[PDB]
Amino acid sequence: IIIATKNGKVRGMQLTVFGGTVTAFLGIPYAQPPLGRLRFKKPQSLTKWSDIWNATKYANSCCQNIDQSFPGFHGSEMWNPNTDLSEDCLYLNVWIPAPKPKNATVLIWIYGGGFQTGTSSLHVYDGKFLARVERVIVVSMNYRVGALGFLALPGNPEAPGNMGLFDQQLALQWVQKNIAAFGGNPKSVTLFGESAGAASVSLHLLSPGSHSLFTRAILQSGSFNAPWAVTSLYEARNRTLNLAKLTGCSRENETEIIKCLRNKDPQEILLNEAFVVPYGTPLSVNFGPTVDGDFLTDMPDILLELGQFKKTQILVGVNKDEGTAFLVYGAPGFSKDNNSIITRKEFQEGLKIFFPGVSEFGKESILFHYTDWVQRPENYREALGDVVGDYNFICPALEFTKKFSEWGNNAFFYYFEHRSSKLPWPEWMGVMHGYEIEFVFGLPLERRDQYTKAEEILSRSIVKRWANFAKYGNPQETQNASTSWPVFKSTEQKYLTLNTESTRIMTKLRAQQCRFWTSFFPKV
Ligand SMILES: *[C@@H]1O[C@H](CO[C@@H]2O[C@@H](C)[C@@H](O)[C@@H](O)[C@@H]2O)[C@@H](O[C@@H]2O[C@H](CO)[C@@H](O)[C@H](O)[C@H]2NC(C)=O)[C@H](O)[C@H]1NC(C)=O
Ligand SMILES: *[C@@H]1O[C@H](CO[C@@H]2O[C@@H](C)[C@@H](O)[C@@H](O)[C@@H]2O)[C@@H](O[C@@H]2O[C@H](CO)[C@@H](O)[C@H](O)[C@H]2NC(C)=O)[C@H](O)[C@H]1NC(C)=O
Ligand SMILES: *[C@@H]1O[C@H](CO)[C@@H](O)[C@H](O)[C@H]1NC(C)=O
Ligand SMILES: *[C@@H]1O[C@H](CO)[C@@H](O)[C@H](O)[C@H]1NC(C)=O
Ligand SMILES: *[C@@H]1O[C@H](CO)[C@@H](O)[C@H](O)[C@H]1NC(C)=O
Ligand SMILES: [Cl-]
Ligand SMILES: [Cl-]
Ligand SMILES: [Cl-]
Ligand SMILES: [Hg+2]
Ligand SMILES: [Hg+2]
Ligand SMILES: [Hg+2]
Ligand SMILES: [Hg+2]
């Protein structure tokens, strides 16, 4: 199993999945290690190579800080990198089904992680199941995160910004020029990602350079119009200069502020990263997407409003309890260890945490809009979750989906409301952010791993749906007489709920709450 690519040959490795085989080329490099003079620079093309390259194991993950909040706790450590962190991390994986497919649809996954963390080698991103079951070719790439992947000094090629996004782009370009060799159809590529990954995907729809690199897109819990997805021109410069200060790289010639930075240590940049913000939040993205004038040509909010984006179908969705996950990372009275029943004062302090630069009035509004009980104990605990959830993910996701449909294309919106039976976090956190990913990747199809049977039916169904969406642009599950998935139109706004129970078509998800977040809040 050796395939010849435009830059050299690569030796894969066979795997055994559900009484069959799947070929896997883990760790194929796709760009020039972004080291030394190349740190902070757009990914440079790769130098062709000779002698069969061995992609039989995940490569290094990119440099990034790590979640040390719950050591030994699986709930969080399952997201932490599982390969050496290195600046040399521009590698991608390919999972082609076995035997070799003739002209297979490609699914390219772009992991989330707040643009600060993440890696394609996570267990929940193992694309061998999707490969095995739908005979699709899955692709993962590691893209630089943190300041090393999103440091910005607008107009300056030494550190322009969106390097992470260009890494992704370079990887898609790679699938364009090489997927054919693996038996893939470069004319049927579907980008799918979660959180900052979904926000990345949504930006590839706006980026003129990614236009021809993919067909369709799937956005799981995230869109560029999310409060956290894009860093302003100001926030970027202040933060880039502050990172300079912390490392003592303050120069008056930007270009030098950068060279002083290329000499610092990969770790010293990761260490000071966390402080470029005065009072960040559990959802602060110190260094992320910016309007560089290259990948992004104008504030993405405008491009969207005026329909300047790749015209194609999109599958967008969110989990029922997007917010909870973050409440235990700084919200007073919260713990993954108790029922975190907080009082009103605690909710009030909670808001101070997430809406830090928000006015006193603005916080009263959130409170007022979210404290209209129907007088019950877990009222404020749940109110805080939805506030964070609705505000950072759910509403933005709905606004993006909506505006995007307004331009003709078919959009499908889902609402994942199934809590994993294996969920390591407490019950009160419900259907947590990021926890639909395993169902999407068919992990529950594997009957060992202690997942209920019903969860298997669901993962199988979602996997079918996702595949059908990639292949045919319609997320249906046409055989086992299931509920049809209607198109999301700007007026009826129907979404399909994904549950183990009875799937249903409903309308205008979080109508009342999102009107507050999408129309009013932007005003305080
Ligand atoms: C823009 O940056 C300034 C400077 O940030 C400070 O220095 C950085 C290296 C880093 O250590 C930050 O955490 C520091 O705050 C910010 O101004 C500071 O603001 C805080 C609180 O308002 C204050 O305690 C400091 O004295 C200020 N420093 C100076 C000299 O201005 C400023 O708030 C940043 N803009 C933003 C994002 O609001
Ligand atoms: C739920 O737990 C939180 C946090 O407590 C943690 O876990 C417990 C074992 C606790 O004893 C501490 O070791 C840990 O901090 C509780 O909130 C804390 O409450 C105390 C006293 O009220 C207060 O001094 C701390 O500041 C709180 N921690 C913070 C900042 O959130 C909370 O009261 C528990 N809720 C219940 C009663 O279920
Ligand atoms: C690649 O793997 C093959 C098979 O295990 C091995 O024979 C070969 O030496 C490897 N190439 C190198 C040196 O990395
Ligand atoms: C794959 O399908 C495309 C049309 O989408 C076609 O142009 C191409 O030749 C096919 N690839 C194969 C089977 O060689
Ligand atoms: C349809 O049901 C069969 C078993 O009766 C199951 O094996 C198959 O996966 C189901 N189809 C899907 C993709 O939901
Ligand atoms: Cl660790
Ligand atoms: Cl009050
Ligand atoms: Cl159904
Ligand atoms: Hg897990
Ligand atoms: Hg469920
Ligand atoms: Hg309903
Ligand atoms: Hg209102």
Swiss-Prot record:
Coiled coil: none annotated. Detected in blood plasma (at protein level). Present in most cells except erythrocytes. The active site is at 195 (acyl-ester intermediate), 322 (charge relay system), 433 (charge relay system). Its main location: secreted. N-glycosylated. No other PTM detected. The major N-glycan structures are of the complex diantennary type with 1 and 2 N-acetylneuraminic acid molecules (Neu5Ac) making up approximately 33% and 47% of the total N-glycans, respectively. Only low amounts of fucosylated diantennary N-glycans are detected (approximately 2%). Triantennary N-glycans with or without fucose amount to approximately 13%, whereas 5% of the total N-glycans are of the oligomannosidic or hybrid type. Changing residue 330 to C: In BCHED; results in 20% of activity compared to wild-type. It is linked to Butyrylcholinesterase deficiency: An autosomal recessive metabolic condition characterized by increased sensitivity to certain anesthetic drugs, including the muscle relaxants succinylcholine or mivacurium. BCHED results in slower hydrolysis of these drugs and, consequently, a prolonged neuromuscular block, leading to apnea. The duration of the prolonged apnea varies significantly depending on the extent of the enzyme deficiency. Esterase with broad substrate specificity. Contributes to the inactivation of the neurotransmitter acetylcholine. Can degrade neurotoxic organophosphate esters. This is Cholinesterase. It comes from Homo sapiens (Human). The lineage of its organism: Eukaryota, Metazoa, Chordata, Craniata, Vertebrata. The gene is BCHE.
